[PDB]
Write a protein that holds these residues in place. Sequence first.
Motif, PDB file in Angstrom:
ATOM      1  N   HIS B  29       2.089  -7.635  -4.170  1.00 44.76           N
ATOM      2  CA  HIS B  29       1.895  -7.190  -2.754  1.00 44.76           C
ATOM      3  C   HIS B  29       0.932  -8.209  -2.092  1.00 44.76           C
ATOM      4  O   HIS B  29      -0.033  -8.571  -2.560  1.00 44.76           O
ATOM      5  CB  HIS B  29       1.240  -5.831  -2.511  1.00 44.76           C
ATOM      6  N   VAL B  31      -1.479  -8.603   0.644  1.00 43.18           N
ATOM      7  CA  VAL B  31      -2.203  -8.059   1.778  1.00 43.18           C
ATOM      8  C   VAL B  31      -3.257  -8.729   2.454  1.00 43.18           C
ATOM      9  O   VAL B  31      -4.188  -9.399   1.502  1.00 43.18           O
ATOM     10  CB  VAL B  31      -2.811  -6.563   1.076  1.00 43.18           C
ATOM     11  N   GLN B  33      -6.919  -9.063   4.982  1.00 40.90           N
ATOM     12  CA  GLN B  33      -7.892  -8.592   5.584  1.00 40.90           C
ATOM     13  C   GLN B  33      -8.643  -9.539   6.703  1.00 40.90           C
ATOM     14  O   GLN B  33      -9.027 -10.501   6.260  1.00 40.90           O
ATOM     15  CB  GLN B  33      -9.301  -8.117   4.809  1.00 40.90           C
ATOM     16  N   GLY B  38      -9.862  -5.580   9.301  1.00 42.86           N
ATOM     17  CA  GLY B  38      -8.737  -4.711   9.475  1.00 42.86           C
ATOM     18  C   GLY B  38      -7.921  -5.021   8.433  1.00 42.86           C
ATOM     19  O   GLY B  38      -7.799  -6.127   7.609  1.00 42.86           O
ATOM     20  N   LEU B  39      -7.051  -4.120   7.866  1.00 42.70           N
ATOM     21  CA  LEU B  39      -6.221  -4.431   6.396  1.00 42.70           C
ATOM     22  C   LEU B  39      -4.705  -4.677   6.879  1.00 42.70           C
ATOM     23  O   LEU B  39      -4.365  -3.735   7.689  1.00 42.70           O
ATOM     24  CB  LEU B  39      -6.313  -3.574   5.356  1.00 42.70           C
ATOM     25  N   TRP B  41      -0.514  -5.115   5.819  1.00 45.03           N
ATOM     26  CA  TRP B  41       0.447  -5.563   4.883  1.00 45.03           C
ATOM     27  C   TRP B  41       1.238  -6.727   5.480  1.00 45.03           C
ATOM     28  O   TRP B  41       1.936  -6.584   6.472  1.00 45.03           O
ATOM     29  CB  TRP B  41       1.296  -4.127   4.547  1.00 45.03           C
ATOM     30  N   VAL B  44       6.175  -7.610   0.605  1.00 44.77           N
ATOM     31  CA  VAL B  44       6.589  -6.824  -0.665  1.00 44.77           C
ATOM     32  C   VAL B  44       7.626  -7.137  -1.355  1.00 44.77           C
ATOM     33  O   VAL B  44       8.619  -7.742  -0.442  1.00 44.77           O
ATOM     34  CB  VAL B  44       7.012  -5.422  -0.462  1.00 44.77           C
ATOM     35  N   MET B  45       7.955  -6.894  -2.578  1.00 50.02           N
ATOM     36  CA  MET B  45       9.080  -7.381  -3.196  1.00 50.02           C
ATOM     37  C   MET B  45       9.471  -6.108  -4.014  1.00 50.02           C
ATOM     38  O   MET B  45       8.920  -6.240  -5.176  1.00 50.02           O
ATOM     39  CB  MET B  45       9.021  -8.326  -4.216  1.00 50.02           C
ATOM     40  N   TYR B  88      -4.822 -11.183  -0.279  1.00 45.62           N
ATOM     41  CA  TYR B  88      -4.930 -10.608  -1.581  1.00 45.62           C
ATOM     42  C   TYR B  88      -3.539 -10.530  -2.081  1.00 45.62           C
ATOM     43  O   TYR B  88      -2.619 -10.409  -1.338  1.00 45.62           O
ATOM     44  CB  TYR B  88      -5.453  -9.335  -1.532  1.00 45.62           C
ATOM     45  N   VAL B 101       4.340   4.500  -3.638  1.00 45.65           N
ATOM     46  CA  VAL B 101       4.113   2.859  -3.888  1.00 45.65           C
ATOM     47  C   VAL B 101       2.481   2.388  -4.036  1.00 45.65           C
ATOM     48  O   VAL B 101       2.114   1.427  -3.221  1.00 45.65           O
ATOM     49  CB  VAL B 101       5.074   2.009  -3.103  1.00 45.65           C
ATOM     50  N   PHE B 103      -0.709   0.888  -4.973  1.00 48.83           N
ATOM     51  CA  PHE B 103      -1.129  -0.753  -4.914  1.00 48.83           C
ATOM     52  C   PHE B 103      -2.720  -1.122  -5.423  1.00 48.83           C
ATOM     53  O   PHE B 103      -3.489  -1.150  -4.875  1.00 48.83           O
ATOM     54  CB  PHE B 103      -1.266  -1.241  -3.374  1.00 48.83           C
ATOM     55  N   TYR B 105      -4.919  -3.660  -6.467  1.00 48.50           N
ATOM     56  CA  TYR B 105      -5.196  -5.082  -6.544  1.00 48.50           C
ATOM     57  C   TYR B 105      -5.808  -5.577  -7.921  1.00 48.50           C
ATOM     58  O   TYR B 105      -5.775  -5.066  -8.826  1.00 48.50           O
ATOM     59  CB  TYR B 105      -6.283  -5.281  -5.225  1.00 48.50           C
TER      60      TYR B 105
END
Lengths: 107, 115
Positions: B29, B31, B33, B38-39, B41, B44-45, B88, B101, B103, B105
């Motif tokens: 994934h 992702v 920041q 703030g984070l 997305w 995705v795969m 990331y 789902v 995640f 890291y």
Amino acid sequence: LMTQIPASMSISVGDRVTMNCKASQNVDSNVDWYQQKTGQSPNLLIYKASNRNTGVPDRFTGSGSGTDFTFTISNMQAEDLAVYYCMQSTSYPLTFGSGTKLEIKRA
Amino acid sequence: SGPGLVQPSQTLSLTCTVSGFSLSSYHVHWVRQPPGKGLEWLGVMWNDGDTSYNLALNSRLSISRDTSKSQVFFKMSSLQTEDTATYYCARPELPGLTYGVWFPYWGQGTLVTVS
């Protein structure tokens, strides 16, 4: 998507704290919780709404129904400061909450 | 890796080297920041090959991988100022077979700066 309240959370050591998130629609139990300690990548705490990930101490617990999920820390310890994030993974796109910064109240 | 300074409109390819496991067995994934913490997305795969993205980067970013060399890629194109952020990659420990789902890291970051 997600809404996380509160934004800031001053807490004393030993205290309990609760952070909650709300989903725009039903996502059942697929909500996880991340801790991003300062100066590091985020890390997993609970997944599946209520299951603790390996290595996480049991002072952290998760719960929630329909659209609202809560992370609870029974006894806040010093290592627990940083920003927490909820995220759902019900369905795509995956989305994270805006974050709740936990700061330790000290003398 | 692959990060760095950015002029708006430029392109860039980030990489992510995995170890300790096979890339066919879990997902990965992208992702980010942003500097205000703030984070978001990015992409995705699914385990089958399909890939989604939010509108934010739809049409500009292109996630891909090499199950053989154990590499995950992000190919940003037409970079905007708002793509500035730490990037990331993560695997998910949640088969969306049962509607989650999660995640995990494992990335330490890689700062892209568009200016």
